[PDB]
Amino acid sequence: GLRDTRPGDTWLADRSWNRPGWTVAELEAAKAGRTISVVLPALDEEDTIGSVIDSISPLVDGLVDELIVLDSGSTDDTEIRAVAAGARVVSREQALPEVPIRPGKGEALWRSLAASRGDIVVFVDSDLINPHPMFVPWLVGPLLTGDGVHLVKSFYRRPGRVTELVARPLLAALRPELGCILQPLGGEYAATRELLTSVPFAPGYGVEIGLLVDTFDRLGLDAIAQVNLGVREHRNRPLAELGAMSRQVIATLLSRCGIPDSGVGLTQFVADGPEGQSYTQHTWPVSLADRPPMQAIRPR
Amino acid sequence: GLRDTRPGDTWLADRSWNRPGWTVAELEAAKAGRTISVVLPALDEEDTIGSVIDSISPLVDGLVDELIVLDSGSTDDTEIRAVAAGARVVSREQALPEVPIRPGKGEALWRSLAASRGDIVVFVDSDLINPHPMFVPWLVGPLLTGDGVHLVKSFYRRPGRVTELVARPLLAALRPELGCILQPLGGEYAATRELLTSVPFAPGYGVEIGLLVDTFDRLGLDAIAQVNLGVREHRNRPLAELGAMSRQVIATLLSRCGIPDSGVGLTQFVADGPEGQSYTQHTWPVSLADRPPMQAIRPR
Numbered sequence: 001g002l003r004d005t006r007p008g009d010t011w012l013a014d015r016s017w018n019r020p021g022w023t024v025a026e027l028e029a030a031k032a033g034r035t036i037s038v039v040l041p042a043l044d045e046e047d048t049i050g051s052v053i054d055s056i057s058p059l060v061d062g063l064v065d066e067l068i069v070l071d072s073g074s075t076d077d078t079e080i081r082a083v084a085a086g087a088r089v090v091s092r093e094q095a096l097p098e099v100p101i102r103p104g105k106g107e108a109l110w111r112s113l114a115a116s117r118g119d120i121v122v123f124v125d126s127d128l129i130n131p132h133p134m135f136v137p138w139l140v141g142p143l144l145t146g147d148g149v150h151l152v153k154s155f156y157r158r159p160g161r162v163t164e165l166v167a168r169p170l171l172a173a174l175r176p177e178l179g180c181i182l183q184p185l186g187g188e189y190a191a192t193r194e195l196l197t198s199v200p201f202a203p204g205y206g207v208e209i210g211l212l213v214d215t216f217d218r219l220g221l222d223a224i225a226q227v228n229l230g231v232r233e234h235r236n237r238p239l240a241e242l243g244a245m246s247r248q249v250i251a252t253l254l255s256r257c258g259i260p261d262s263g264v265g266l267t268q269f270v271a272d273g274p275e276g277q278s279y280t281q282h283t284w285p286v287s288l289a290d291r292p293p294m295q296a297i298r299p300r
Numbered sequence: 301g302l303r304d305t306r307p308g309d310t311w312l313a314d315r316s317w318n319r320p321g322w323t324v325a326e327l328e329a330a331k332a333g334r335t336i337s338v339v340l341p342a343l344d345e346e347d348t349i350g351s352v353i354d355s356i357s358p359l360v361d362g363l364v365d366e367l368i369v370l371d372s373g374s375t376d377d378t379e380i381r382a383v384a385a386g387a388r389v390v391s392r393e394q395a396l397p398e399v400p401i402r403p404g405k406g407e408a409l410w411r412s413l414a415a416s417r418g419d420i421v422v423f424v425d426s427d428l429i430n431p432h433p434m435f436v437p438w439l440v441g442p443l444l445t446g447d448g449v450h451l452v453k454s455f456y457r458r459p460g461r462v463t464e465l466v467a468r469p470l471l472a473a474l475r476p477e478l479g480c481i482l483q484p485l486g487g488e489y490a491a492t493r494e495l496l497t498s499v500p501f502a503p504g505y506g507v508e509i510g511l512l513v514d515t516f517d518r519l520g521l522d523a524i525a526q527v528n529l530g531v532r533e534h535r536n537r538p539l540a541e542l543g544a545m546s547r548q549v550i551a552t553l554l555s556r557c558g559i560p561d562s563g564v565g566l567t568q569f570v571a572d573g574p575e576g577q578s579y580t581q582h583t584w585p586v587s588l589a590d591r592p593p594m595q596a597i598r599p600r
């Protein structure tokens with residue numbers, strides 16, 4: 001199983017595997033009137049976003065019915081570079097004009113449900129360094145070979161900390177059935193519109209884990225598959241922000257589990273000098289506020 | 301406050317500071333019939349333990365009434381080297397013969413309550429690299445200048461991960477009042493026997509955080525002070541063990557907070573090779589079992 005795994009192989013909930021024997025073209029034939037949207041959430045990713053689109057670009061009007069960059073307030077060259085690469089850029093405002101904006105990644109992904117049309121939505125981070133062109137095919141595979149699967153999570157070999165020390169040990173504690181999930185926080189995943197629009201979306205860095213847990217609670221482990229995406233490269237996560245990310249992952253998971261979170265942000269104490277003679281007190285925001293199921297706002 | 305802090309300064313619960321103006325000799329005079337025990341928990345620390353004792357050694361028969369190494373099953377030269385340095389070595393069995401041994405650090409510290417006699421117990425890790433001779437004086441300071449303080453936690457400048465990403469964000473979520481604690485997991489701390497023998501001891505890597513939270517719940521923030529211990533050096537924590545440590549910190553905190561922990565260990569998936577073609581599944585143990593207050597076993 002995980003003793004013999006390829007870029008392409010799917011792990012199902014019953015610990016059974018599948019090594020895909022289709023072509024991109026055969027996957028398109030399997031769609032059967034189901035449409036596919038690809039969504040790239042982007043905040044200030046001018047360096048990487050053209051490359052990411054180029055990887056997915058060839059699939060459009062074939063396997064992929066639409067390719068959207070959800071621009072989350074970029075002040076760099078993200079939009080013009082995504083357009084020149086061939087993607088349609090939708091701002092948060094454009095996606096859902098009648099609801100005021102909240103900050104964070106979860107907001108952007110939630111809004112993209114309103115901006116996209118696809119029966120299946122694939123999410124891919126725009127900060128990926130050289131994503132393999134087979135990423136979207138590999139992600140959608142298990143949805144199209146339809147066996148009750150509604151969420152496809154990815155796993156990869158690193159070519160970190162918050163996943164290994166925070167997300168996974170907390171899942172072992174609070175949702176032990178999800179202990180099989182290698183990469184609960186990863187931004188490459190696919191799901192049905194039916195699933196996506198029926199669940200609330202966690203704010204900020206909580207979005208992926210909130211979706212995982214909501215899917216498990218409502219549909220059980222069988223609705224969740226994982227695909228080996230191989231060696232996956234992304235940008236260095238600046239170490240300064242990781243405390244805030246952990247705090248938000250914690251807030252989201254506690255809230256899914258029915259445990260009251262104080263709503264009190266992490267205060268970090270940063271030594272100002274080598275002697276530890278003074279500290280800068282830095283308090284990051286945490287959000288306990290989900291967005292409601294998209295069905296409650298923009299129903300289909 | 302933390303805008304101007306020395307090796308020696310104490311932070312109290314009301315955000316007020318104290319910069320000590322005593323000598324080791326004046327601290328001894330302040331004891332007033334209170335005895336002081338120093339306890340060094342040790343599992344296989346032959347390289348560092350002589351040095352640690354040498355730092356504390358000069359205080360014995362003066363400020364320090366006894367110095368005990370609690371040997372937690374060492375198969376290297378820890379015991380002979382601690383003896384030659386001048387400490388008394390007590391095995392777990394010797395400390396408390398009538399209770400069977402459980403593994404982990406918390407067990408060793410709990411047992412040391414039975415092995416030691418001091419009204420005040422100071423705990424110092426035996427893996428410290430060149431601890432400053434003032435560590436024990438600085439730790440006991442706030443207990444002897446008696447103003448209702450029962451627990452003294454330390455903080456230091458690093459000359460990590462589990463503290464910053466796991467312990468502190470979870471405390472912000474579940475015990476926000478303890479958000480002021482810089483180093484909740486640190487092994488250098490002092491407390492009263494009255495406090496120590498009245499609380500249960502968490503197992504393994506949960507011991508320090510369990511003690512912090514128990515103290516807070518039972519006595520409030522005022523009973524807790526923190527002392528700047530300056531630049532503090534210890535051994536590199538092998539990165540492999542950190543998941544298990546986080547999982548146990550999580551288990552202990554959830555249990556203190558009244559939240560059911562599954563008792564299911566973290567399963568880590570270690571890539572066997574560069575390709576991510578197979579993973580080794582490695583499941584670390586977690587313990588939900590405290591030891592009871594020492595008063596229930598070996599009352600004074």
